[PDB]
Amino acid sequence: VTKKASHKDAGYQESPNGAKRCGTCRQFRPPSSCITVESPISENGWCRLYAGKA
Ligand code: SF4
């Protein structure tokens, strides 16, 4: 498999960015398996990669 981004290289933060959050993101796969970053991932999160899904 191709290597995943670290919580560094995805730009993870300890608080969400307004309305942009992991627990509402198109990438997250509940309960916790984001396709953008290494596992686990918090309910709040946000990453430095954009998505067109609000
Ligand atoms: S780290 Fe980013 S891509 Fe992954 S679930 Fe969170 S907001 Fe989505």
Q: Using alpha carbons only, what angle is made at residue 48 by residues 16 and 12, rounded to the nearest 5 degrees? A: 55
Does the C-beta of 25 come closer than 6 Å to ligand 1?
Answer: yes
Mutate to test the pocket of ligand 1, among 28, 38, 53 (most ligand atoms within 8 A of CB): 28
Method: NMR
Domain extents in the chain: 1-54
> What string of DSSP letters covers 7-35?
TTTTT--SS-BTTB-GGG-TT-TTTT--S
CA–CA distance, 42 with 23 (Å, rounded to integer):
8
Does the C-beta of 33 come closer than 6 Å to ligand 1?
Answer: no
Residue with CA nearest ligand 1 atom 6: 22
Q: Distances from the Cα of 54 to the Cαs of 1, 44, 51, in angstroms?
A: 29, 15, 8
- The conformation of residue 5, written as its DSSP 8-state character, comes to B
- Cα 13 from chain centroid? 10
CA–CA distance, 13 with 36 (Å, rounded to integer):
14
